[PDB]
């Protein structure tokens, strides 16, 4: 047969029934919201019905230079999306989602509408497109109204102008795509006819659970990597190295003495301290048994010795001597260690309680190069807003908190050709990671 398939004010209309279409009495056609275009067209082709369609009145794709070079996890994401050209790419903040998107834009070479949730992400996307694509894009939002083959628009104005733009862009890129299932925006997604959709988010799940709507509105997830995955040995772009030191003779005496006290107690009560449920029991008993408290104290005090051993400062001196010419930031968890390190080497220190005036002075005098090395604590301070350093030296910590890993990924992604993260650990002391 000769089915006619036509776009109309955010809907698709049809001579004939296709699954997902429903007859309109008002329109005298089988209809649905324009987003069903791709699927009903493909329904008709795969049954050899001649499809006479005027649906997509696409803007001309503009002239671009591709200035993008991708890391290789970035390209597997592009390769994933390209198989179906309808889906979400989940990457953490700072893993470069924008450049995966703009690479797709250049591969596809079709008019592209990029939907963002805030005015700052308009100007940001505008800047990234100039740099990496050498095109000044159209902008709809904030009070500006220019419309070009590549356009950045707010969710609000995409919703407002959907029937007008629904058929103009074949590629539809939803930044912060977790916004899309919200009340107004979900019907905006359904009004576009755009057959090719790319969603970007680091937070695909929603507390209302409306991420269940993704396959309908954008496509399913087709690629996801955590920051933990993206901080692997073979995938990250900085080396991770553990240098091992031994406790002081006096430290080893105290440390071992504490461990024995703790172990003997635990054995004297039929308790163990292997996992984090064991810990909860010991903390619970410590509220009302003095000896349990002192045991939990022994645990903390021995842990503190291993983490903050003076031998780590001696090793730190060796490292700072090996890298006289690099830009080094030393991290601790405790504030007291940061002061030991700043006194020992006469380097600036930053804790969570540093006045914002001085804190701003230190990091800037660091990025300008008057301070070649600083030390910083991380208890109660995110490693945020920090400049580029070639070398991170992490002294202590209960492992690495996920944000910390993320935060350090950003400080050394900038860093150089290849940068280095050194963690200093003590040799004989027990593993304290409790599951």
């Amino acid at each position: 047969g000769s089915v006619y398939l036509r776009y109309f004010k955010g809907l698709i209309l049809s001579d004939a029934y296709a699954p997902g279409l429903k007859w309109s009495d008002e329109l005298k056609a089988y209809s649905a919201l324009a987003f069903k275009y791709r699927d009903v067209r493909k329904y008709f082709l795969e049954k050899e019905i001649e499809v006479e369609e005027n649906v997509i009145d696409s803007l001309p794709f503009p002239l671009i230079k591709d200035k993008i070079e991708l890391r290789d996890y970035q390209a597997e994401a592009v390769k994933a999306w390209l198989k179906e050209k309808r889906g979400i790419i989940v990457l953490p903040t700072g893993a470069g989602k924008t450049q995966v998107a703009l690479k797709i834009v250049s591969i596809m070479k079709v008019a592209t509408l990029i939907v963002v949730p805030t005015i700052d992400l308009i100007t940001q996307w505008k800047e990234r497109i100039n740099k990496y694509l050498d095109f000044d894009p159209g902008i709809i939002g904030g009070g500006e109204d220019s419309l070009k083959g590549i356009t950045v628009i707010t969710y609000d104005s995409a919703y407002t102008r959907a029937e007008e733009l629904g058929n103009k862009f074949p590629l539809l890129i939803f930044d912060e795509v977790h916004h899309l299932p919200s009340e107004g925006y979900s019907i905006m997604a359904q009004l576009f006819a755009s057959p090719y959709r790319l969603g970007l988010t680091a937070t695909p799940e929603r507390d209302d659970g409306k991420h269940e709507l993704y396959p309908i509105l954008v496509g399913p997830i087709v690629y996801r990597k955590s920051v933990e995955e993206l901080a692997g040995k073979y995938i990250a772009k900085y080396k991770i190295k553990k240098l091992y030191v031994s406790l002081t003779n006096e430290e080893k005496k105290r440390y071992d003495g504490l461990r024995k006290k703790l172990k003997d107690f635990l054995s004297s009560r039929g308790l163990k301290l292997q996992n984090l449920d064991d810990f909860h029991r010991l903390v619970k008993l410590a509220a009302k048994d003095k000896e349990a408290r002192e045991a939990l104290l022994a645990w903390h005090e021995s842990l503190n010795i291993a983490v903050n051993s003076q031998s780590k400062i001696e090793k730190l001196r060796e490292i700072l001597q090996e890298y006289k010419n690099e830009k080094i930031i030393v991290f601790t968890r405790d504030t007291q260690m940061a002061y030991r390190i700043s006194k020992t080497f006469l380097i600036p220190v930053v804790t969570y309680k540093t006045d914002k005036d001085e804190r701003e002075e230190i990091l800037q005098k660091f990025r300008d190069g008057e301070y070649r090395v600083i030390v910083a604590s991380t208890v109660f301070d995110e490693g945020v807003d920090v400049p580029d350093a070639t070398l991170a030296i992490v002294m202590g910590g209960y492992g690495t908190k996920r944000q910390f890993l993320q935060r350090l990924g950003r400080i050394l992604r900038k860093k150089d050709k290849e940068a280095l993260l050194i963690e200093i650990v003590t040799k004989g002391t027990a593993d304290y990671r409790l599951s």
Partner: protein, 374 residues
Amino acid sequence: MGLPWELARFSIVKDEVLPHFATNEDLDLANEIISLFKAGKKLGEIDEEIEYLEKIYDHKLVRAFVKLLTRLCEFELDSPIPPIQIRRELFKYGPVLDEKEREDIIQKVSKKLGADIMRFVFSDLDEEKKIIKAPTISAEDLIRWYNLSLLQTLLFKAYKLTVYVSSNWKEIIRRAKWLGLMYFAYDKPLRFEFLGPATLVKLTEKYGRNLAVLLQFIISSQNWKIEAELVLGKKFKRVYKLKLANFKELKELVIDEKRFDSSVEEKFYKDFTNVIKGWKIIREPEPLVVDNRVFIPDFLVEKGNLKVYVEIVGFWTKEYIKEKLDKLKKVKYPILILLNEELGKEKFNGMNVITYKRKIDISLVYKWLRELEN
């Protein structure tokens, strides 16, 4: 201040506010934290030594005990030279990796700035302040002093603080007057209804710090009862009752000596008795009771058959003096009010009111008396 509101510890049941006071169950915790405050120890060392205690015990209480115990310590005097200049000019020497070169950098910087740099390099930072004298407090007393500080912290949100009288009422108002509090006395049960720091929009800070000094005397009484109305929320405000009577586990350790000074009422007495001879000036006259509202004047002055009463008022608001005078229209005498312009937002003017700045200008009282003696 009491305690920071972030450390306030209370629960709301129905329309009542119940404070979470410390009890004997907290003696262990109090002893283990008291033992941590020893002379020659840094506050930031203690922050790390209590960490496990914040896993075992309620960390709002752990933090309050430390913030109270530090408040009882003596620290070294501030450094001669602002310590941030000590570190800018010490840290400009990059990282020093030789022990000998370090000592020389130190002495070089100590001669330029004229101080012992190491002793003071981090002296402006709480974490590095070293204790010289440790507090003397007992575990019981800290619990006691915690509870009084928690009570004060909650009364700072009070719209109204009704104090009921056992014994020393005439001793309460005295302090309330020497502290400049805003209040209405009543008689159905004899009680004082102090207006709370939520009344003020302006100088709540300074008001609350004196209201709290009044608590100290109230709860020293053999029998006391207070009911505060507290206001919580910014745009939807609801009122809650705090009802508290004969709670023995309170103790003040803020000396706060020399804060409630009768400079103004005493000077006025000298000036008036000297400069005016036509009137007889009786001090602390018997309070008057008009339909179960008590009026406690500061002075009664009389010339023959004319009788007028003087009240001095320390803090005030437009709505307070309006209310005070409205209720004074029904006292059936001439009454002269003396307001302090500094403790107000609006610079008031009334038919029976004389403002004063730092003392009372006896000129104006003399003027006022004859301009209606006729």
